[PDB]
């Protein structure tokens, strides 16, 4: 059984980073070497593991988290990072064991006039725990007066859009990110293969 990595990397539409998508990978053979030898390749940084010697050991479960951010925010998909993405949308733990994969998707996720499909969380009462997801749409109360569920003074909708246009700079162009988490619990191996 070959691991369904094509459904994750080659998806027609990616999720918004605030509602990042997770695909659990189990009971299959993953040629982590066949995914590294692709055309569209940019960021491929692994933590706690080695990409040269990937498909050599065994894991209990492999999680694939996919979303879209702008170019200048790919740096935040790393342990011990701060910013709107790392604090309010997608947070990696300090002891993260996995790989972060990203590539430019300006040809797919941009549109003349603006592609407003992808959102991100701009405000939140506190930072996210590692691998926490917040899809709430509660009006953020910046002041002391209650917001009553509508935007107003010191009351902002917490989600903001990117509006990707193909004429943006690289730092503002959309990037599709895939985060591979490698779990090793007290269970027999389920995912490994050359």
């Amino acid at each position: 059984n070959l691991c369904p990595f094509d459904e994750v990397f080659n998806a027609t539409r990616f999720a918004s980073v605030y509602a990042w998508n997770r695909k659990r990978i189990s009971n299959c053979v993953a040629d982590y070497s066949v995914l590294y030898n692709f055309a569209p390749f940019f960021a491929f940084k692994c933590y706690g593991v080695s990409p040269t010697k990937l498909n050599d050991l065994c894991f209990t479960n492999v999680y694939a988290d996919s979303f879209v951010i702008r170019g200048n925010e790919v740096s935040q998909i790393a342990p011990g990072q701060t910013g709107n993405i790392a604090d309010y949308n997608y947070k990696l733990p300090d002891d993260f064991t996995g790989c972060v994969i990203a590539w430019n998707s300006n040809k797919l996720d941009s549109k003349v006039g603006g592609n407003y499909n992808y959102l991100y969380r701009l405000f939140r009462k506190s930072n996210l725990k590692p691998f926490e997801r917040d899809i709430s749409t509660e009006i953020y109360q910046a002041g002391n007066k209650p917001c009553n569920g509508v935007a107003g003074f010191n009351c902002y909708f917490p989600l903001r859009s990117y509006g990707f246009r193909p004429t943006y700079g690289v730092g503002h162009q959309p990037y599709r990110v895939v985060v591979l988490s490698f779990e090793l619990l007290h269970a027999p191996a389920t995912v490994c293969g050359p």
Binding site: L122, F123, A142, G143, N154, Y156
Partner: peptide, 9 residues
Amino acid sequence: EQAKTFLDK
């Protein structure tokens, strides 16, 4: 602090 959040928006 409210002005910082306002300017942020």
